């Protein structure tokens, strides 16, 4: 377990949200370009919630 997820490593369309119930940022990185961002650990980001459909 190593919560080193960050908004750069995020994927456009999915809301990077914290488990406390807060929207931090949506994935600013678009999947078109090969995104390999730094593994900067942003613990305030829990997981990405893409539309549940």
Short mmCIF file of C-alpha atoms in Angstrom, two decimals:
data_model
loop_
_atom_site.label_atom_id
_atom_site.label_comp_id
_atom_site.label_asym_id
_atom_site.label_seq_id
_atom_site.Cartn_x
_atom_site.Cartn_y
_atom_site.Cartn_z
CA UNK A 1 0.00 0.00 0.00
CA UNK A 2 1.56 3.23 -1.16
CA UNK A 3 -0.83 6.10 -1.86
CA UNK A 4 1.30 7.94 -4.34
CA UNK A 5 -1.50 8.86 -6.58
CA UNK A 6 -1.57 12.46 -7.74
CA UNK A 7 -3.61 14.70 -10.01
CA UNK A 8 -0.97 14.51 -12.79
CA UNK A 9 -1.22 10.74 -12.81
CA UNK A 10 -4.95 11.19 -12.97
CA UNK A 11 -7.06 10.42 -15.95
CA UNK A 12 -9.44 13.00 -17.51
CA UNK A 13 -13.07 12.09 -16.92
CA UNK A 14 -12.50 10.57 -13.54
CA UNK A 15 -12.93 12.62 -10.40
CA UNK A 16 -10.00 12.28 -8.04
CA UNK A 17 -11.71 12.35 -4.82
CA UNK A 18 -10.78 11.86 -1.27
CA UNK A 19 -12.41 9.23 0.91
CA UNK A 20 -13.52 11.92 3.37
CA UNK A 21 -16.03 12.87 0.70
CA UNK A 22 -14.29 15.70 -1.07
CA UNK A 23 -13.63 16.41 -4.73
CA UNK A 24 -9.98 17.30 -5.00
CA UNK A 25 -9.55 17.57 -8.74
CA UNK A 26 -10.57 15.74 -11.82
CA UNK A 27 -7.85 14.03 -13.80
CA UNK A 28 -6.17 16.85 -15.63
CA UNK A 29 -4.19 14.50 -17.76
CA UNK A 30 -5.80 13.40 -20.94
CA UNK A 31 -5.26 9.73 -21.97
CA UNK A 32 -4.38 10.84 -25.55
CA UNK A 33 -0.84 11.68 -24.62
CA UNK A 34 1.26 8.95 -22.93
CA UNK A 35 1.12 10.26 -19.42
CA UNK A 36 3.76 9.03 -17.05
CA UNK A 37 3.84 11.62 -14.34
CA UNK A 38 6.04 11.68 -11.28
CA UNK A 39 5.09 9.30 -8.47
CA UNK A 40 4.54 12.15 -6.12
CA UNK A 41 2.46 10.87 -3.32
CA UNK A 42 -0.60 13.04 -2.84
CA UNK A 43 -2.29 11.25 0.14
CA UNK A 44 -5.17 13.69 0.13
CA UNK A 45 -6.25 11.98 -3.07
CA UNK A 46 -7.78 8.66 -2.32
CA UNK A 47 -9.08 7.30 -5.57
CA UNK A 48 -10.52 8.28 -8.83
CA UNK A 49 -14.19 7.95 -9.15
CA UNK A 50 -15.18 7.62 -12.76
CA UNK A 51 -18.99 7.87 -13.51
CA UNK A 52 -20.70 4.84 -11.98
CA UNK A 53 -22.39 3.78 -15.19
#
